RNA sequence: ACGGAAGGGCACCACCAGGAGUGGAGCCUGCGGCUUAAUUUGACUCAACACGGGGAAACUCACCAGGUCCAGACACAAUAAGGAUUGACAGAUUGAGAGCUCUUUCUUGAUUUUGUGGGUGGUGGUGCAUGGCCGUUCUUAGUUGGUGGAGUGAUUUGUCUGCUUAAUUGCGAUAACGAACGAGACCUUAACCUACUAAAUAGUGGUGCUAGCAUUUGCUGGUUAUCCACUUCUUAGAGGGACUAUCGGUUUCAAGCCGAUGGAAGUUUGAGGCAAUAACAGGUCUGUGAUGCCCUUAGACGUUCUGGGCCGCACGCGCGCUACACUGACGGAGCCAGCGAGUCUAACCUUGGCCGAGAGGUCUUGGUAAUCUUGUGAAACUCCGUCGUGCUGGGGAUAGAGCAUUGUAAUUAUUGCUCUUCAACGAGGAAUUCCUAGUAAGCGCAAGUCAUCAGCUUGCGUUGAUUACGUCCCUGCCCUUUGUACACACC
C-alpha cells in the first residue's frame, strides 16, 4: 500500500486494459516484467489489495497469478473515474 | 524448391501413420519426392533417487523418453503444401517445413 | 532457436504447467483434464469437464481472462491462444472426477 | 538465545522524526512590499527547479545527479 | 535499494535453482527443465518421463 | 510373537570348489570423540557411515561476530500539508551515495509513526497427527471370496497325502469343487528382419579428374550432385522368434531333470521395470510453500552483506583410489568403442593459425545438432633399453619454489603443469565382503552439482580358470506342527 503514484497508476491501468498480473517471485528485483516498478512493490501491493479482498492470487509453481474480481473492477472502475462503456475489461 | 517435412514427435504409431498418409498421398498425386527418412529415435535418461532423503537402500530409476524424428524431401508449391497439413490433421504431430 | 531435444521438453513443461495451473484454480469448479491442438498461429486448448456452462461463467469472462491469463504467462502472440469447454463422456469413469465429488461430498459433510 | 550475551553497549538508534522546528525558508523580510526570490538553482540542465542551493559551509548539493556531482571554486 | 544484493546472484546455485521449491540441491540442468529431482518424480508421467527399466 | 522345541522349503546378500581390494601402508570422502564464536544438522541389527546424488571458494546450512528491511492488515485518537519512514554527500563506521546515528539539509510528498481476539512468513520442534514418496516386509516368496463339508461358536478344509521346479509354478490330491490378486503374465536397448522404403551422415563393379607400380585386369584419398535394379554395418511397420524342435536314459513307464548332423542360445533367451488383503510409531513440521499445534511481526528464529563454518586434531569406524616391480614405472612409434552430450536477452561446445613449451580470447564455408568435439586415436598388444634373486628406478601420496583460468573477491596450496626430497608397503594374524556368467575384476569414456577438476552415483568397450543338479554351523527368511498366563501382541 505504500507505493508511488505513478506505480499505483501504472498496475490500475495494466489491471483495466489487461485483468490480470503476472508476477515472477523475485523480490527487491526492481525490474518487473513488462513494467518499471519493483516487482516488491507490486507483490505487495496485490497482496494488501487481497487482504482488502477485491482481487485474487494463485502460487502455480512460484509464479503469482494476480486475477481480478467484480468489486475489485468496480472499485478500481470508481478510484479511476472512468464513463460507462468506454474501455470494458472482458472485450473478445 | 527441395522442401523438407520434417515430423518431431514421440507418438510411435501416429508418426508411421502420418509418415504413411504423406506418402500415400505423394503417391497418389504423382509427384517425384524421397522416401520418408528415420533419425534414430533418441532416448532421453534421466537416472535420479527413488527416495526424497537417504533411507533405505541405494536405488535409483531411469526415466526414459523416447522422441522419433523423421523427414520426407517433397517439391510442392506452398498451397499443396498447406492442403495436404491441412488433410490427414491429428493432434500433437509436430511437423515442420524447411527449405534447402 | 531450441534444439528439439530441449524443446520437447520445454513442451512438456508448458503442458504440465498448464494442467497444474487449471486443476489449482479450478479444483472448486469440478476440473478434469485438458487437450491441446497447435496450428499455425492459433494454439486451442480444451477443457474436457463435467459443468461446462459453469466453468464459462457469464457471458465468458472466466475463459477471456483465462486465455489472457496463459498469454501473459507463457509470453506468447497476443490473442493467439483460445481455450473452449465440453462437456466428458462417461464422466464417472476418471478417478479424479470421482475424487472431486467426494471432496464436494466431504465439503457437504455427510457419514 | 545462549550464546548472545549482548556485552556490546546499548546502541538502538531509531531514526528521527524530523522534529519540527520554527518557520524556514528565510527569503528576506519585507514589510509592504515584494520579498525577492533567492537561490539561484544549479544551471546544469538535470536540475528541475527543484534542489534548493543552500550554502551552509561552502558546499554545494544536487538531488537529480545522485552519484556525480563535484565542484570546487 | 541496490545494497541488498551486492553480492552477485548471476550464476551458481544461488541463481540456478527449481521453479517449485526454490532449492538449490538435487537440480537437474539436463534438456534444461532445471526442476528438483523429486518434483520430477512426481510430475514425470505428465511430463512425458516414463518409467520403462 | 518364543524356543538351545518336530521338522522341512529356500537364499554365491551362506557353504563344500575357487577367484577379487577391504582387516598391514599413503590419501581425498561420510560418522562418533575433543577445542572453539562456530566446527551445530538428520539418519545406527541386513533397514546409519562416497547417504540426503551432501567433493565444504561466496552463493546452497539451519551454526556463528557484527551493522541494515518489513510484506506490521479489521477501525480510529493523539503532534493531524507551520506534516512521518524507505533512496543521501558530514566531525566518526564502512568494499559504498546502510542522513542507520546531534547544532544545520534533501529526488518526490496523506503513501499514516503508535496500540487489540483475527494473523500473512520460517531449515525453530514432535514421524507421540501423519499424508505423499522410498527402504524393509518380499525378491522370482504369499494371500482372498462363492458354493459344499467339520464345528453351537469364534473358525477350519479349501491353501496338501508323494513331491520335480534359482515361486502353493505345477502332476497327482486324503471333503472338496470352482474363481480372484502376487506370481506367472506385459517389453528395446542383447540379433539375422538378405519380403518392402531407409544418411549431399553409405558401398563396391565400373563411373570425370589424381600421386606412385609394368603404359602386366587396377588400387587408397578428395571437393558433391559426377552415375547405373540395392540395402551387406544403425533406427521402424499391419506381420518375424527358438514353443527346451526331434530322438536316446530316470518317474502305480504322471509333472520334470539330462546328452545329441541347426536357428541368435535350446540351463526359464540376457538384465531390468511395473508389482502380495495387512505391518515398522523405519527417513523427511530439519534440500520440498502438506500443514493445526508451543515460538515472530520496531533491533524477528524471515531476508541482505563481510569474515569464519559440513575445510580444525591426541583419536576409532566402512565405502573408494594407489602399490608390493621384466605383467608394471616406463619412452620414443602402428591400430579401435555403443546408448548419449552439447548456443536466444544466452553468444555455449577447447575444430586450423597470433599473441603462446600448454592452459584466455582475437577469425566460425562446424552445431538447433549421427557429419565441430566424434566414426570418442585413451583401456589392454608388438622391434629396442634400466629396476637385472634391491634399505628402492614400483610408490609425482610424504614439502618448497615457480608457469596458467569464467568469477566486482580463491588466502588454512579453487584445479592443471616444471623441477627438486620415497619418514610407510616382503599373499597382509583372528572375523567378515561380492560373485556362474562370457560375472566379480584387470582400465578409460558419457551425465548429475558445477567456476574448477571426483575417487560418489546411472550407462560400454579385450577376457576369465575347477561347482551351477548339491545343506544349516555361523547372515538369515518362510511354512506348518508344538507351548502361552500376549494383545501400543516379548519393546
Redesign the interface.
Given at each position: 500500500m505504500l507505493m508511488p503514484k505513478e506505480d499505483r497508476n501504472k498496475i490500475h491501468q495494466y489491471l483495466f486494459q489487461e485483468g490480470v498480473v503476472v508476477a515472477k517471485k523475485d523480490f527487491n528485483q526492481a525490474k518487473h516484467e513488462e513494467i518499471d516498478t519493483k516487482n516488491l512493490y507490486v507483490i505487495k501491493a496485490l497482496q494488501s489489495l487481497t487482504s482488502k479482498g477485491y482481487v485474487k492470487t494463485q502460487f502455480s509453481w512460484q509464479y503469482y497469478y494476480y486475477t481480478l474480481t467484480e468489486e475489485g473492477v468496480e472499485y478500481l472502475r470508481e478510484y479511476l473515474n472512468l464513463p460507462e462503456h468506454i474501455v470494458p475489461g472482458t472485450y473478445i | 524448391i527441395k522442401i523438407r517435412i520434417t515430423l518431431?514427435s514421440?507418438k510411435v504409431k501416429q508418426l508411421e501413420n502420418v509418415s504413411s498418409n504423406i506418402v500415400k498421398n505423394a503417391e497418389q498425386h504423382n509427384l517425384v519426392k524421397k522416401g520418408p527418412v528415420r533419425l534414430p529415435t533418441?532416448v532421453?535418461k534421466?537416472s535420479?533417487?527413488?527416495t526424497?532423503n537417504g533411507e533405505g537402500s541405494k536405488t535409483w530409476?531411469?526415466?526414459?523418453?523416447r522422441?522419433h524424428?523423421r523427414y520426407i524431401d517433397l517439391e510442392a508449391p506452398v498451397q499443396i503444401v498447406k492442403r495436404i497439413t491441412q488433410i490427414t490433421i491429428e493432434?500433437?504431430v509436430?511437423v515442420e517445413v524447411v527449405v534447402a | 532457436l531450441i534444439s528439439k531435444k530441449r524443446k520437447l521438453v520445454a513442451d512438456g513443461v508448458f503442458y504440465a504447467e498448464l494442467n497444474e495451473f487449471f486443476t489449482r484454480e479450478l479444483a472448486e469448479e469440478g476440473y478434469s483434464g485438458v487437450e491441446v491442438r497447435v496450428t499455425p498461429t492459433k494454439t486451442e486448448v480444451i477443457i474436457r469437464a463435467t459443468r461446462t456452462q459453469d466453468v464459462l461463467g457469464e457471458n465468458g469472462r472466466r475463459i477471456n481472462e483465462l486465455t489472457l491469463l496463459v498469454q501473459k504467462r507463457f509470453k506468447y502472440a497476443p490473442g493467439t491462444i483460445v481455450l473452449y469447454a465440453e462437456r466428458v463422456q462417461d464422466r464417472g469413469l476418471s478417478a479424479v472426477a470421482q475424487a472431486e465429488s467426494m471432496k464436494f461430498k466431504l465439503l457437504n459433510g455427510l457419514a | 538465545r545462549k550464546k548472545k550475551v549482548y556485552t556490546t553497549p546499548k546502541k538502538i538508534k531509531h531514526k528521527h522524526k524530523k522534529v519540527k522546528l520554527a518557520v524556514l525558508s528565510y527569503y528576506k523580510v519585507d514589510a509592504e512590499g515584494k520579498v525577492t526570490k533567492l537561490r539561484r538553482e544549479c544551471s546544469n540542465p538535470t536540475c528541475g527547479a527543484g534542489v534548493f542551493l543552500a550554502n551552509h559551509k561552502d558546499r554545494l548539493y544536487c538531488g537529480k545527479c545522485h552519484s556525480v556531482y563535484k565542484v570546487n571554486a | 535499494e541496490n545494497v541488498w544484493f551486492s553480492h552477485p546472484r548471476r550464476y551458481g546455485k544461488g541463481s540456478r535453482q527449481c521453479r517449485v521449491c526454490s532449492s538449490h540441491t538435487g537440480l537437474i540442468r539436463k534438456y534444461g527443465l532445471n526442476i528438483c529431482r523429486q518434483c520430477f518424480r512426481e510430475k514425470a508421467n505428465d511430463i512425458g518421463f516414463n518409467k520403462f527399466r
Open positions: - | 518431431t514421440t533418441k532421453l534421466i535420479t533417487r527413488k526424497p530409476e531411469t526415466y526414459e523418453m522422441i524424428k493432434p500433437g509436430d | - | - | -
